Symmetry: C5
Subunit: 50 residues, 5 copies
């Protein structure tokens, strides 16, 4: 009962954590894609100015 | 089992706190993606300004 | 046993960390608003 | 004694958590320092207006 | 036994958390690097202006 309820509760937690982890992964990839766009825009303006 | 029910309550309590935190992070994540879109929008404006 | 006090201890750590994240979020939204204000200011000048 | 082993495991988890929290705190401090440098540069470009 | 299940599950959790920690730490490195690139570009534009 108790150890089976706890194993269920731990599975449910793990599922919640995994989905959060995936979302932070996705956000990380979005930040790196942003950082690449940022670099590319600086370049475009450097060429434009010089 | 009093101690077991206490723990169960403690675990449920912390999970609601996690869920609220996770909500707050989802909200922040949406605000960041709105900002990233604004940043692109203003890049386009400044590029228009120079063209 | 010692479990219940130990859990209370890490729970306080968590609550405090959560509040430090809320404080950073606050700071980030103030920064995002200032970023917007600066863009508006320069647009006002450049157009 | 199962509860004694769990108590030690929990000490190790708490020390790992504490490390992560110190690294989060240090990043926060870095971000605030960056925010201030960003505002100073805005104020600087504002002299080109 | 069930408690050997708990110890096992705990260790598996810790390995999954450790990967997340490592990933956040990698992200924090990439943010600092970005911060350096941002500081450099601000100088680059400061010179174009004088």
């Amino acid at each position: 009962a108790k150890w089976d309820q706890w194993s269920s509760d731990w599975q449910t937690w793990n599922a919640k954590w995994d989905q959060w982890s995936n979302d932070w992964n996705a956000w990380r990839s979005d930040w790196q894609a942003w950082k690449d766009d940022w670099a590319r825009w600086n370049q475009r303006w450097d060429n434009w100015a010089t």
